[PDB]
Write a protein that binds this ligand. Structure first.
Ligand SMILES: [Cl-]
Ligand SMILES: [Cl-]
Ligand SMILES: [Cl-]
Ligand SMILES: [K+]
Ligand code: NA
Ligand code: NA
Ligand code: NA
Length: 128
């Protein structure tokens, strides 16, 4: 699901693009303010948007949802895994775990208001 007045690609950026790494409790409010609920888990990718978008041009592989719009990053990236440890919104508190892993993104053509790449990331399908 995504906030219905946004596109999937915009929500993907909100949730997962974080080249400037942040503390989980601070960063997670940007996500949770949209839903008024504490998300249980979220991965922040510490790479620039354009480096994530470039992954969309690599070999297409099957996603968990069995679409064929997934792509494996060419390199591992730094990430932060934020996991909910206590609270109901707005008092959401998280633990953080540092990771350095490959990721698999799903991409689709942009929808109205997205930047005019051929393909934009829409889901973080998995990490490796
Ligand atoms: Cl969309
Ligand atoms: Cl997303
Ligand atoms: Cl979907
Ligand atoms: K859309
Ligand atoms: Na969907
Ligand atoms: Na929604
Ligand atoms: Na999305």
């Amino acid at each position: 699901m995504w906030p219905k007045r946004l596109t999937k690609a915009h929500w993907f950026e909100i949730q997962h693009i974080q080249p400037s790494p942040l503390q989980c409790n601070r960063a997670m409010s940007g996500i949770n303010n949209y839903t008024q609920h504490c998300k249980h888990q979220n991965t922040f990718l510490h790479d620039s948007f354009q480096n994530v978008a470039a992954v969309c041009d690599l070999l297409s592989i099957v996603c968990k949802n069995r679409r064929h719009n997934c792509h494996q990053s060419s390199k591992p990236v730094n990430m932060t895994d934020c996991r909910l440890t206590s609270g109901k919104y707005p008092q959401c508190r998280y633990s953080a775990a540092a990771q350095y892993k490959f990721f698999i993104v799903a991409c689709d053509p942009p929808q109205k208001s997205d930047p005019p790449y051929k393909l934009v990331p829409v889901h973080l399908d998995s990490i490796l």
